[PDB]
C-alpha cells in the first residue's frame, strides 16, 4: 500500500476526473500497461496488481510504477447522519484518465511480459492494454 | 534387432561390486537376480581399469539371463583424473573452474569412437569438447 509521506492538508476535495492523462509514452522500460479506461485506483489495487505481475516475471528485470496514489478519500462511518463534518480519510486513490501508463517493464521477454501484464491487468478495475516503447 | 523391452543404462562405478545403496532395486526391478550384477558385471571390468562408471546394455529376457554388450564411459566422469579437478559445473560462465586444451581432449576422443557415431573424427571432436563447455570449462584451442 503506497501512500504520501506527510502532506500539506489531510482531507481534500472530491473533484472531477475530466481530461486525458499526460503519461502517454513509455519512458523507462521496454513495455508498458496503458489505461484505456478512466477512474481512480486505490493504493491496494496498485499493490495487488504489483505483486500479481512481479510473480510472473519471477523477480527478474525491473518494473516501474508510473502512478502514485496522492489523493485522500474520506468516508462517513456506517450508521452516521449527514453533516457534522467531512469524514475521516481511508485510502489513497490515484485518478487515471485514459492513456495513462501504469506499469512499465524491462529485462524480460516480450510474450512473457504479455503474460505478466495480463495477470496484473486482471487486478485493475479499469480496462488497460499492452503497449511498447517507440523510437519517438 | 528387437526394439525396447526392459534394457536400461544405469549403474555407478564398475569397481563397486554388487551395488545396493546406489542402484539397488532398479537393477533388481526385473526378474534378474541381484547376484548377476557382480559375478558377471566384473567379468569385463577386470579387462580394463576398475572404478570407472561404464554403462552397459541390460536386455532382460524370460530365459533367466540376458545378453549384454559393454559400451563407453561418459565424458563427464572422464573429466576428473584427466582434468585434475574432481569438480565440474555449477558455476559455468560466471567463473573459470578449469581448462585443458584441444591437443589433449581430441587425443582421447577416438578411444570413445567405438561407441560414437561420426562420419569423421573431426566431427566427433567438438561434439565431445562441446560437452566440457557445459561444465564451464574453456578449451584451449
Amino acid at each position: 500500500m503506497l501512500q504520501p509521506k506527510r502532506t500539506k492538508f489531510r482531507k481534500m476535495h472530491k473533484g472531477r476526473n475530466r481530461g486525458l492523462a499526460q503519461g502517454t509514452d513509455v519512458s523507462f522500460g521496454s513495455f508498458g500497461l496503458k489505461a484505456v479506461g478512466r477512474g481512480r485506483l486505490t493504493a491496494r489495487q496498485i499493490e495487488a496488481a504489483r505483486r500479481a505481475m512481479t510473480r510472473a516475471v519471477k523477480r527478474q528485470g525491473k518494473i516501474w510504477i508510473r502512478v502514485f496514489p496522492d489523493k485522500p478519500i474520506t468516508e462517513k462511518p456506517l450508521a452516521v447522519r449527514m453533516g457534522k463534518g467531512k469524514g475521516n480519510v481511508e485510502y489513497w486513490v490515484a485518478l487515471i484518465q485514459p492513456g495513462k501508463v501504469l506499469y512499465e517493464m524491462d529485462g524480460v521477454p516480450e510474450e512473457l511480459a504479455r503474460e505478466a501484464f495480463k495477470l496484473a491487468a486482471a487486478k485493475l478495475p479499469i480496462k488497460t492494454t499492452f503497449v511498447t516503447k517507440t523510437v519517438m | 534387432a528387437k526394439k525396447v523391452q526392459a534394457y536400461v543404462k544405469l549403474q555407478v562405478a564398475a569397481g563397486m561390486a554388487n551395488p545396493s545403496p546406489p542402484v539397488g532395486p532398479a537393477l533388481g526391478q526385473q526378474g534378474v537376480n541381484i547376484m548377476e550384477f557382480c559375478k558377471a558385471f566384473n567379468a569385463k571390468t577386470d579387462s580394463i581399469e576398475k572404478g570407472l562408471p561404464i554403462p552397459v546394455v541390460i536386455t532382460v529376457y524370460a530365459d533367466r539371463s540376458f545378453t549384454f554388450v559393454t559400451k563407453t564411459p561418459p565424458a563427464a566422469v572422464l573429466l576428473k583424473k584427466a582434468a585434475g579437478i574432481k569438480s565440474g559445473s555449477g558455476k559455468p560462465n560466471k567463473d573459470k573452474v578449469g581448462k585443458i586444451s584441444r591437443a589433449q581432449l581430441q587425443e582421447i576422443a577416438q578411444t570413445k569412437a567405438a561407441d560414437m557415431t561420426g562420419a569423421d573424427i573431426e566431427a566427433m571432436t567438438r561434439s565431445i569438447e562441446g560437452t566440457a563447455r557445459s561444465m564451464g570449462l574453456v578449451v584451449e584451442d
Binding site: 486525458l20 492523462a21 502517454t24 509514452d25 496503458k34 489505461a35 484505456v36 485514459p98 492513456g99 492494454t129 517507440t134 523510437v135 519517438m136 | -
Partner: protein
C-alpha cells in the same frame, strides 16, 4: 519505398480536423528553412504501417505534394491517447 502522396490542406482549425480525423486521414505540416510553413494533409492508413520501422523516425521521407517532392524528417509526432492511431506529425524539411 518512403513516399507518401498528400493533398494540400484547405481548412485549418480544430473543427475541420475532427471531420478529417474520422475519415482515416490525419492532418500534418511541413516546415523549416527560409520557406514559409505549408500544411500537408495525408492519409492515415498508409503512415500507420510505416512507423513500425526504426528507419521511419530517422531516414528522410520523400513526401510528394502537388507533383513537387519535399524531403522531410519526423522530428515530432503526436500519439493518440489510447486508440492505436496517429493524430499529427511535424515533418521538418531536410
Amino acid at each position: 519505398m518512403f513516399t507518401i502522396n498528400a493533398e494540400v490542406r484547405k481548412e485549418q482549425g480544430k473543427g475541420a480536423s475532427r471531420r478529417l480525423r474520422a475519415a482515416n486521414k490525419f492532418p500534418a505540416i511541413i516546415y523549416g528553412g527560409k520557406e514559409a510553413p505549408l500544411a500537408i494533409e495525408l492519409d492515415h492508413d498508409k503512415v500507420m504501417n510505416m512507423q513500425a520501422k526504426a528507419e521511419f523516425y530517422s531516414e528522410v521521407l520523400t513526401i510528394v505534394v502537388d507533383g513537387k517532392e519535399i524531403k522531410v524528417k519526423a522530428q515530432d509526432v503526436q500519439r493518440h491517447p489510447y486508440k492505436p492511431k496517429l493524430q499529427h506529425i511535424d515533418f521538418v524539411r531536410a
